[PDB]
């Protein structure tokens, strides 16, 4: 009674698609109580619901021979409802039993060719002769009243929803031959489910948009104000105009597209007229959506604006923007690659206040995009899309389409040997028997250049607590700072504590200090932004203090993050390590991290994790309360963490079943966490090499005796095969010597040994 | 010899030992009562409502003196030098 018009009219009596063998285009096989629930009498026509208001109706007959769970239909109505078999369809009567005054069905000649005559007497007679055939205004029904499939395109129907077109009222023969090529122009209206990798942000766009659009009365009544404009932004080609078309085509709202260059390419003084005639025409129509695409072209930073007419379109845009108020019920959205590349006068309140962020798709978004872009190809059975989605690590929503196109072209190319050089009469199997293999996808992947290799990736990591193993104390002391302030925030209000906002790991170099950040980020399902040393040290060699702000503001729009500043000591040891000229702590970059860290309220759930190998040169201005507070010393793996590390590195490589990792982890004693990832690779080359060697030597010896005929040898080495490790152990070094351990173990007892009041006891 | 900002980690680290306990004594109770899901007598009003001394007994085990006694000398040997450069004392106007 407060939250219930929010449904899309889902019904208990939904009938699911069931195949039929009939040729009548308006016969329905319904459940037996279908005439009974709503007391559906005979003599009317029901209103079946598909999508995008692109539907197709039937004449509802007392033919209830089907079952109680599904509906049996032909291709005609279910497909002309613009829904495939697998879309929900509502059943509901429509009292619009009307007779067509002047209709307009558009034939296609190839289906019509043969007998032509006059359209009326030759085709409208044997089709409309009281044949139980009502339509919906604007469809293309399929005619099985001949030997072959024939479609006529409905355009005009005097009743607005639809009617039972009858010959009793005159029917014009003004239909005209159309072509199959014209379907995509109407299918420019894109359904909702044709977007992948955006299930996280599309929810935000929905909650912002449909509630203001499909329920104006609630907003006008309660008085809460819908947004005056969204501002999507992301790397180019992630399919944003498609998002706008989806959002405005599945909510029933007129859509108007303003291109960027198309405005900035007309005569000086004519573009502004186009902007006015766009914002004017939109407000006249229904609740609309203006999508000002490529906004950083008609409104760059001022530092690009140099002409006067270049700065008059911006003013016209601002005037039209703030001219919007609640009367018009119009909503605007934009698109730019990076938020700060827009004129700052636009973000002021009332114009583009709120700002969604489409990002690079993540490991499952790529799978969804691939499954969308390969729903037409004839993939071979050996295809594995969950595989190819895994290694494409820079691609965006447009690169994957090109990749699939390239694989299809490669299949065509391998078919060209048997294709005649002048094969205009391309044979049926040459058009249909095509099958793309993993050979093709790996080839095309190797021949693709990713478009987005240089953007910080914000996605939940997959490494879990079972890889590191051990480290029991760190597990708890890292839960209680990243998970508790997220899963139980009210406990932090029952008492008065403010959550911590920092940790500082320090340990021997290369000892799984990164895997702990990813593990804890994987626990609480939090994003994970990694900043590497070779990146901060770039900032120290030029501009600073203009990108750290942007890093933090990126982490803010994706809470809860676990921002991981790797090698906080990079600048400090790249400046002298107690530099000779004098410079003590400040380095123009860490200072900026401080300035941003303090100016960030704890309510936002952003936790900053550092990691250093030289935990004394680190600036003493960060180890102060209110900033990175404590220090956790990550020791070398002891006995169980080594077993887990070995079993984590040896997962993708088929290992022998008689290998004793419990022994190999018991002899390797002071080994780091990064010299057990070497033993588990140098023990692969010793099996790779012995594989190519024996392959080549067999191909040799067989050619020595070609008449030997001896064939069908399966494989000489499928397996890492112990007595490989027994050799890879001969090149196994130790990263950190003992003196490099009693250097940190003698720093812990410097942070320690200034404590120890545990003798404290409350008297009585 | 405790600073004004080392008594604010005997007063927080004495609360992360209550947040811990009241967030364990909750979760532990969930798994407990699945032994008797039909008991219908569950949900004690408060397992730990209170900072509850014997926490400061423990939080005092991670109390670190920030300013060592060898660094508080550099100041007391300054302010004492602003004095001893003063004191005209027996100054007294005639009659």
PDB file of N, CA and C in Angstrom, chain A residues 259-340:
ATOM      1  N   UNK A 259      23.708  15.181 -31.720  1.00  0.00           N
ATOM      2  CA  UNK A 259      25.094  14.805 -31.917  1.00  0.00           C
ATOM      3  C   UNK A 259      26.009  15.976 -31.582  1.00  0.00           C
ATOM      4  N   UNK A 260      27.269  15.663 -31.308  1.00  0.00           N
ATOM      5  CA  UNK A 260      28.221  16.682 -30.943  1.00  0.00           C
ATOM      6  C   UNK A 260      28.752  17.449 -32.134  1.00  0.00           C
ATOM      7  N   UNK A 261      29.497  16.769 -33.006  1.00  0.00           N
ATOM      8  CA  UNK A 261      30.005  17.446 -34.205  1.00  0.00           C
ATOM      9  C   UNK A 261      28.920  18.005 -35.101  1.00  0.00           C
ATOM     10  N   UNK A 262      27.781  17.323 -35.211  1.00  0.00           N
ATOM     11  CA  UNK A 262      26.729  17.798 -36.103  1.00  0.00           C
ATOM     12  C   UNK A 262      26.243  19.187 -35.710  1.00  0.00           C
ATOM     13  N   UNK A 263      26.405  19.565 -34.444  1.00  0.00           N
ATOM     14  CA  UNK A 263      26.075  20.925 -34.034  1.00  0.00           C
ATOM     15  C   UNK A 263      27.225  21.870 -34.355  1.00  0.00           C
ATOM     16  N   UNK A 264      28.451  21.467 -34.028  1.00  0.00           N
ATOM     17  CA  UNK A 264      29.622  22.318 -34.182  1.00  0.00           C
ATOM     18  C   UNK A 264      30.159  22.353 -35.605  1.00  0.00           C
ATOM     19  N   UNK A 265      29.390  21.893 -36.587  1.00  0.00           N
ATOM     20  CA  UNK A 265      29.859  21.895 -37.962  1.00  0.00           C
ATOM     21  C   UNK A 265      28.985  22.711 -38.897  1.00  0.00           C
ATOM     22  N   UNK A 266      28.058  23.502 -38.376  1.00  0.00           N
ATOM     23  CA  UNK A 266      27.204  24.317 -39.220  1.00  0.00           C
ATOM     24  C   UNK A 266      27.648  25.775 -39.176  1.00  0.00           C
ATOM     25  N   UNK A 267      26.992  26.595 -39.993  1.00  0.00           N
ATOM     26  CA  UNK A 267      27.369  27.997 -40.111  1.00  0.00           C
ATOM     27  C   UNK A 267      27.280  28.694 -38.760  1.00  0.00           C
ATOM     28  N   UNK A 268      28.292  29.507 -38.460  1.00  0.00           N
ATOM     29  CA  UNK A 268      28.353  30.230 -37.196  1.00  0.00           C
ATOM     30  C   UNK A 268      27.091  31.054 -36.984  1.00  0.00           C
ATOM     31  N   UNK A 269      26.317  30.707 -35.961  1.00  0.00           N
ATOM     32  CA  UNK A 269      25.024  31.313 -35.716  1.00  0.00           C
ATOM     33  C   UNK A 269      23.848  30.437 -36.080  1.00  0.00           C
ATOM     34  N   UNK A 270      24.079  29.303 -36.737  1.00  0.00           N
ATOM     35  CA  UNK A 270      23.013  28.365 -37.053  1.00  0.00           C
ATOM     36  C   UNK A 270      22.949  27.193 -36.082  1.00  0.00           C
ATOM     37  N   UNK A 271      24.069  26.843 -35.447  1.00  0.00           N
ATOM     38  CA  UNK A 271      24.075  25.747 -34.484  1.00  0.00           C
ATOM     39  C   UNK A 271      23.160  26.042 -33.302  1.00  0.00           C
ATOM     40  N   UNK A 272      23.254  27.255 -32.759  1.00  0.00           N
ATOM     41  CA  UNK A 272      22.416  27.634 -31.628  1.00  0.00           C
ATOM     42  C   UNK A 272      20.943  27.479 -31.967  1.00  0.00           C
ATOM     43  N   UNK A 273      20.573  27.787 -33.209  1.00  0.00           N
ATOM     44  CA  UNK A 273      19.202  27.558 -33.638  1.00  0.00           C
ATOM     45  C   UNK A 273      18.839  26.086 -33.535  1.00  0.00           C
ATOM     46  N   UNK A 274      19.762  25.195 -33.902  1.00  0.00           N
ATOM     47  CA  UNK A 274      19.483  23.766 -33.798  1.00  0.00           C
ATOM     48  C   UNK A 274      19.310  23.335 -32.349  1.00  0.00           C
ATOM     49  N   UNK A 275      20.154  23.843 -31.452  1.00  0.00           N
ATOM     50  CA  UNK A 275      19.980  23.518 -30.039  1.00  0.00           C
ATOM     51  C   UNK A 275      18.621  23.990 -29.536  1.00  0.00           C
ATOM     52  N   UNK A 276      18.216  25.199 -29.930  1.00  0.00           N
ATOM     53  CA  UNK A 276      16.915  25.706 -29.512  1.00  0.00           C
ATOM     54  C   UNK A 276      15.781  24.864 -30.073  1.00  0.00           C
ATOM     55  N   UNK A 277      15.850  24.500 -31.351  1.00  0.00           N
ATOM     56  CA  UNK A 277      14.779  23.712 -31.947  1.00  0.00           C
ATOM     57  C   UNK A 277      14.817  22.257 -31.514  1.00  0.00           C
ATOM     58  N   UNK A 278      15.868  21.838 -30.816  1.00  0.00           N
ATOM     59  CA  UNK A 278      15.875  20.522 -30.187  1.00  0.00           C
ATOM     60  C   UNK A 278      15.223  20.572 -28.809  1.00  0.00           C
ATOM     61  N   UNK A 279      15.736  21.430 -27.923  1.00  0.00           N
ATOM     62  CA  UNK A 279      15.113  21.570 -26.610  1.00  0.00           C
ATOM     63  C   UNK A 279      13.680  22.083 -26.676  1.00  0.00           C
ATOM     64  N   UNK A 280      13.283  22.753 -27.757  1.00  0.00           N
ATOM     65  CA  UNK A 280      11.906  23.208 -27.894  1.00  0.00           C
ATOM     66  C   UNK A 280      11.000  22.083 -28.365  1.00  0.00           C
ATOM     67  N   UNK A 281      11.450  21.324 -29.363  1.00  0.00           N
ATOM     68  CA  UNK A 281      10.638  20.234 -29.881  1.00  0.00           C
ATOM     69  C   UNK A 281      10.480  19.126 -28.852  1.00  0.00           C
ATOM     70  N   UNK A 282      11.519  18.866 -28.056  1.00  0.00           N
ATOM     71  CA  UNK A 282      11.432  17.810 -27.054  1.00  0.00           C
ATOM     72  C   UNK A 282      10.384  18.133 -25.996  1.00  0.00           C
ATOM     73  N   UNK A 283      10.401  19.361 -25.472  1.00  0.00           N
ATOM     74  CA  UNK A 283       9.463  19.725 -24.414  1.00  0.00           C
ATOM     75  C   UNK A 283       8.016  19.613 -24.873  1.00  0.00           C
ATOM     76  N   UNK A 284       7.753  19.835 -26.162  1.00  0.00           N
ATOM     77  CA  UNK A 284       6.391  19.697 -26.668  1.00  0.00           C
ATOM     78  C   UNK A 284       5.893  18.267 -26.518  1.00  0.00           C
ATOM     79  N   UNK A 285       6.758  17.294 -26.777  1.00  0.00           N
ATOM     80  CA  UNK A 285       6.364  15.893 -26.816  1.00  0.00           C
ATOM     81  C   UNK A 285       6.243  15.337 -25.399  1.00  0.00           C
ATOM     82  N   UNK A 286       6.157  14.014 -25.303  1.00  0.00           N
ATOM     83  CA  UNK A 286       5.976  13.248 -24.076  1.00  0.00           C
ATOM     84  C   UNK A 286       7.174  13.451 -23.153  1.00  0.00           C
ATOM     85  N   UNK A 287       7.176  12.891 -21.930  1.00  0.00           N
ATOM     86  CA  UNK A 287       8.420  12.893 -21.155  1.00  0.00           C
ATOM     87  C   UNK A 287       9.556  12.358 -22.001  1.00  0.00           C
ATOM     88  N   UNK A 288      10.503  13.219 -22.332  1.00  0.00           N
ATOM     89  CA  UNK A 288      11.492  12.913 -23.344  1.00  0.00           C
ATOM     90  C   UNK A 288      12.839  12.631 -22.701  1.00  0.00           C
ATOM     91  N   UNK A 289      13.825  12.351 -23.544  1.00  0.00           N
ATOM     92  CA  UNK A 289      15.206  12.201 -23.117  1.00  0.00           C
ATOM     93  C   UNK A 289      16.069  12.794 -24.216  1.00  0.00           C
ATOM     94  N   UNK A 290      16.762  13.873 -23.910  1.00  0.00           N
ATOM     95  CA  UNK A 290      17.765  14.422 -24.807  1.00  0.00           C
ATOM     96  C   UNK A 290      19.116  13.856 -24.413  1.00  0.00           C
ATOM     97  N   UNK A 291      19.807  13.255 -25.372  1.00  0.00           N
ATOM     98  CA  UNK A 291      21.116  12.659 -25.141  1.00  0.00           C
ATOM     99  C   UNK A 291      22.120  13.489 -25.922  1.00  0.00           C
ATOM    100  N   UNK A 292      22.746  14.448 -25.249  1.00  0.00           N
ATOM    101  CA  UNK A 292      23.720  15.305 -25.905  1.00  0.00           C
ATOM    102  C   UNK A 292      25.033  14.550 -25.981  1.00  0.00           C
ATOM    103  N   UNK A 293      25.221  13.797 -27.054  1.00  0.00           N
ATOM    104  CA  UNK A 293      26.391  12.946 -27.163  1.00  0.00           C
ATOM    105  C   UNK A 293      27.631  13.785 -27.454  1.00  0.00           C
ATOM    106  N   UNK A 294      28.788  13.241 -27.077  1.00  0.00           N
ATOM    107  CA  UNK A 294      30.080  13.865 -27.356  1.00  0.00           C
ATOM    108  C   UNK A 294      30.127  15.288 -26.802  1.00  0.00           C
ATOM    109  N   UNK A 295      29.687  15.433 -25.552  1.00  0.00           N
ATOM    110  CA  UNK A 295      29.540  16.757 -24.959  1.00  0.00           C
ATOM    111  C   UNK A 295      30.867  17.491 -24.850  1.00  0.00           C
ATOM    112  N   UNK A 296      31.971  16.772 -24.745  1.00  0.00           N
ATOM    113  CA  UNK A 296      33.241  17.489 -24.667  1.00  0.00           C
ATOM    114  C   UNK A 296      33.686  18.047 -26.009  1.00  0.00           C
ATOM    115  N   UNK A 297      32.791  18.064 -26.995  1.00  0.00           N
ATOM    116  CA  UNK A 297      33.035  18.715 -28.271  1.00  0.00           C
ATOM    117  C   UNK A 297      32.300  20.033 -28.426  1.00  0.00           C
ATOM    118  N   UNK A 298      31.114  20.172 -27.833  1.00  0.00           N
ATOM    119  CA  UNK A 298      30.381  21.430 -27.873  1.00  0.00           C
ATOM    120  C   UNK A 298      30.564  22.225 -26.590  1.00  0.00           C
ATOM    121  N   UNK A 299      31.372  21.732 -25.666  1.00  0.00           N
ATOM    122  CA  UNK A 299      31.616  22.430 -24.414  1.00  0.00           C
ATOM    123  C   UNK A 299      32.923  21.953 -23.800  1.00  0.00           C
ATOM    124  N   UNK A 300      34.059  22.235 -24.422  1.00  0.00           N
ATOM    125  CA  UNK A 300      35.331  21.765 -23.868  1.00  0.00           C
ATOM    126  C   UNK A 300      35.712  22.566 -22.641  1.00  0.00           C
ATOM    127  N   UNK A 301      36.899  22.328 -22.095  1.00  0.00           N
ATOM    128  CA  UNK A 301      37.412  23.255 -21.103  1.00  0.00           C
ATOM    129  C   UNK A 301      37.600  24.627 -21.740  1.00  0.00           C
ATOM    130  N   UNK A 302      37.474  25.668 -20.913  1.00  0.00           N
ATOM    131  CA  UNK A 302      37.718  27.019 -21.406  1.00  0.00           C
ATOM    132  C   UNK A 302      39.075  27.107 -22.089  1.00  0.00           C
ATOM    133  N   UNK A 303      40.079  26.430 -21.537  1.00  0.00           N
ATOM    134  CA  UNK A 303      41.437  26.433 -22.061  1.00  0.00           C
ATOM    135  C   UNK A 303      41.530  25.889 -23.479  1.00  0.00           C
ATOM    136  N   UNK A 304      40.458  25.307 -24.012  1.00  0.00           N
ATOM    137  CA  UNK A 304      40.351  25.033 -25.437  1.00  0.00           C
ATOM    138  C   UNK A 304      39.493  26.048 -26.170  1.00  0.00           C
ATOM    139  N   UNK A 305      38.499  26.624 -25.500  1.00  0.00           N
ATOM    140  CA  UNK A 305      37.669  27.643 -26.124  1.00  0.00           C
ATOM    141  C   UNK A 305      38.505  28.882 -26.406  1.00  0.00           C
ATOM    142  N   UNK A 306      38.584  29.262 -27.666  1.00  0.00           N
ATOM    143  CA  UNK A 306      39.344  30.456 -28.016  1.00  0.00           C
ATOM    144  C   UNK A 306      38.540  31.460 -28.825  1.00  0.00           C
ATOM    145  N   UNK A 307      37.710  31.001 -29.754  1.00  0.00           N
ATOM    146  CA  UNK A 307      36.854  31.894 -30.499  1.00  0.00           C
ATOM    147  C   UNK A 307      35.697  32.389 -29.654  1.00  0.00           C
ATOM    148  N   UNK A 308      34.921  33.297 -30.241  1.00  0.00           N
ATOM    149  CA  UNK A 308      33.732  33.787 -29.560  1.00  0.00           C
ATOM    150  C   UNK A 308      32.525  32.900 -29.829  1.00  0.00           C
ATOM    151  N   UNK A 309      32.278  32.566 -31.098  1.00  0.00           N
ATOM    152  CA  UNK A 309      31.186  31.660 -31.426  1.00  0.00           C
ATOM    153  C   UNK A 309      31.402  30.303 -30.778  1.00  0.00           C
ATOM    154  N   UNK A 310      32.651  29.959 -30.467  1.00  0.00           N
ATOM    155  CA  UNK A 310      32.911  28.731 -29.730  1.00  0.00           C
ATOM    156  C   UNK A 310      32.406  28.827 -28.295  1.00  0.00           C
ATOM    157  N   UNK A 311      32.353  30.033 -27.726  1.00  0.00           N
ATOM    158  CA  UNK A 311      31.826  30.235 -26.382  1.00  0.00           C
ATOM    159  C   UNK A 311      30.410  30.787 -26.364  1.00  0.00           C
ATOM    160  N   UNK A 312      29.716  30.807 -27.495  1.00  0.00           N
ATOM    161  CA  UNK A 312      28.317  31.203 -27.484  1.00  0.00           C
ATOM    162  C   UNK A 312      27.380  30.008 -27.458  1.00  0.00           C
ATOM    163  N   UNK A 313      27.793  28.892 -28.054  1.00  0.00           N
ATOM    164  CA  UNK A 313      27.007  27.668 -27.977  1.00  0.00           C
ATOM    165  C   UNK A 313      26.940  27.171 -26.541  1.00  0.00           C
ATOM    166  N   UNK A 314      28.034  27.313 -25.794  1.00  0.00           N
ATOM    167  CA  UNK A 314      28.033  26.904 -24.394  1.00  0.00           C
ATOM    168  C   UNK A 314      27.026  27.724 -23.598  1.00  0.00           C
ATOM    169  N   UNK A 315      27.007  29.040 -23.813  1.00  0.00           N
ATOM    170  CA  UNK A 315      26.055  29.885 -23.102  1.00  0.00           C
ATOM    171  C   UNK A 315      24.625  29.546 -23.489  1.00  0.00           C
ATOM    172  N   UNK A 316      24.383  29.280 -24.773  1.00  0.00           N
ATOM    173  CA  UNK A 316      23.046  28.880 -25.191  1.00  0.00           C
ATOM    174  C   UNK A 316      22.632  27.579 -24.522  1.00  0.00           C
ATOM    175  N   UNK A 317      23.562  26.629 -24.426  1.00  0.00           N
ATOM    176  CA  UNK A 317      23.277  25.369 -23.754  1.00  0.00           C
ATOM    177  C   UNK A 317      22.931  25.592 -22.291  1.00  0.00           C
ATOM    178  N   UNK A 318      23.700  26.434 -21.600  1.00  0.00           N
ATOM    179  CA  UNK A 318      23.420  26.697 -20.191  1.00  0.00           C
ATOM    180  C   UNK A 318      22.065  27.366 -20.009  1.00  0.00           C
ATOM    181  N   UNK A 319      21.744  28.340 -20.861  1.00  0.00           N
ATOM    182  CA  UNK A 319      20.442  28.995 -20.780  1.00  0.00           C
ATOM    183  C   UNK A 319      19.312  27.997 -20.971  1.00  0.00           C
ATOM    184  N   UNK A 320      19.413  27.153 -21.997  1.00  0.00           N
ATOM    185  CA  UNK A 320      18.372  26.159 -22.226  1.00  0.00           C
ATOM    186  C   UNK A 320      18.293  25.181 -21.065  1.00  0.00           C
ATOM    187  N   UNK A 321      19.443  24.835 -20.493  1.00  0.00           N
ATOM    188  CA  UNK A 321      19.494  23.885 -19.393  1.00  0.00           C
ATOM    189  C   UNK A 321      18.759  24.422 -18.174  1.00  0.00           C
ATOM    190  N   UNK A 322      19.200  25.568 -17.657  1.00  0.00           N
ATOM    191  CA  UNK A 322      18.552  26.149 -16.489  1.00  0.00           C
ATOM    192  C   UNK A 322      17.164  26.688 -16.793  1.00  0.00           C
ATOM    193  N   UNK A 323      16.775  26.750 -18.067  1.00  0.00           N
ATOM    194  CA  UNK A 323      15.400  27.081 -18.387  1.00  0.00           C
ATOM    195  C   UNK A 323      14.444  25.946 -18.090  1.00  0.00           C
ATOM    196  N   UNK A 324      14.972  24.746 -17.865  1.00  0.00           N
ATOM    197  CA  UNK A 324      14.137  23.615 -17.490  1.00  0.00           C
ATOM    198  C   UNK A 324      13.634  23.777 -16.063  1.00  0.00           C
ATOM    199  N   UNK A 325      12.357  23.473 -15.856  1.00  0.00           N
ATOM    200  CA  UNK A 325      11.791  23.342 -14.524  1.00  0.00           C
ATOM    201  C   UNK A 325      10.755  22.228 -14.560  1.00  0.00           C
ATOM    202  N   UNK A 326      10.145  21.963 -13.403  1.00  0.00           N
ATOM    203  CA  UNK A 326       9.377  20.735 -13.212  1.00  0.00           C
ATOM    204  C   UNK A 326       8.188  20.628 -14.163  1.00  0.00           C
ATOM    205  N   UNK A 327       7.747  21.746 -14.742  1.00  0.00           N
ATOM    206  CA  UNK A 327       6.610  21.727 -15.661  1.00  0.00           C
ATOM    207  C   UNK A 327       6.857  20.798 -16.846  1.00  0.00           C
ATOM    208  N   UNK A 328       8.007  20.947 -17.508  1.00  0.00           N
ATOM    209  CA  UNK A 328       8.210  20.305 -18.802  1.00  0.00           C
ATOM    210  C   UNK A 328       8.337  18.794 -18.666  1.00  0.00           C
ATOM    211  N   UNK A 329       8.886  18.324 -17.545  1.00  0.00           N
ATOM    212  CA  UNK A 329       9.097  16.898 -17.291  1.00  0.00           C
ATOM    213  C   UNK A 329      10.074  16.288 -18.292  1.00  0.00           C
ATOM    214  N   UNK A 330      11.127  17.026 -18.608  1.00  0.00           N
ATOM    215  CA  UNK A 330      12.162  16.590 -19.532  1.00  0.00           C
ATOM    216  C   UNK A 330      13.410  16.267 -18.728  1.00  0.00           C
ATOM    217  N   UNK A 331      14.186  15.302 -19.209  1.00  0.00           N
ATOM    218  CA  UNK A 331      15.414  14.887 -18.546  1.00  0.00           C
ATOM    219  C   UNK A 331      16.518  14.774 -19.585  1.00  0.00           C
ATOM    220  N   UNK A 332      17.684  15.301 -19.262  1.00  0.00           N
ATOM    221  CA  UNK A 332      18.812  15.376 -20.179  1.00  0.00           C
ATOM    222  C   UNK A 332      19.918  14.467 -19.672  1.00  0.00           C
ATOM    223  N   UNK A 333      20.696  13.899 -20.587  1.00  0.00           N
ATOM    224  CA  UNK A 333      21.899  13.190 -20.184  1.00  0.00           C
ATOM    225  C   UNK A 333      22.969  13.381 -21.245  1.00  0.00           C
ATOM    226  N   UNK A 334      24.220  13.213 -20.845  1.00  0.00           N
ATOM    227  CA  UNK A 334      25.355  13.542 -21.692  1.00  0.00           C
ATOM    228  C   UNK A 334      26.300  12.350 -21.789  1.00  0.00           C
ATOM    229  N   UNK A 335      27.481  12.593 -22.350  1.00  0.00           N
ATOM    230  CA  UNK A 335      28.484  11.542 -22.482  1.00  0.00           C
ATOM    231  C   UNK A 335      29.836  12.189 -22.710  1.00  0.00           C
ATOM    232  N   UNK A 336      30.811  11.844 -21.878  1.00  0.00           N
ATOM    233  CA  UNK A 336      32.164  12.358 -22.010  1.00  0.00           C
ATOM    234  C   UNK A 336      33.131  11.280 -21.551  1.00  0.00           C
ATOM    235  N   UNK A 337      34.364  11.342 -22.048  1.00  0.00           N
ATOM    236  CA  UNK A 337      35.292  10.266 -21.722  1.00  0.00           C
ATOM    237  C   UNK A 337      35.844  10.384 -20.308  1.00  0.00           C
ATOM    238  N   UNK A 338      36.110  11.603 -19.844  1.00  0.00           N
ATOM    239  CA  UNK A 338      36.703  11.825 -18.541  1.00  0.00           C
ATOM    240  C   UNK A 338      36.020  13.052 -17.950  1.00  0.00           C
ATOM    241  N   UNK A 339      35.619  13.004 -16.678  1.00  0.00           N
ATOM    242  CA  UNK A 339      34.769  14.073 -16.139  1.00  0.00           C
ATOM    243  C   UNK A 339      35.394  15.452 -16.166  1.00  0.00           C
ATOM    244  N   UNK A 340      36.698  15.582 -15.966  1.00  0.00           N
ATOM    245  CA  UNK A 340      37.287  16.908 -15.839  1.00  0.00           C
ATOM    246  C   UNK A 340      37.533  17.585 -17.179  1.00  0.00           C
TER     247      UNK A 340
END
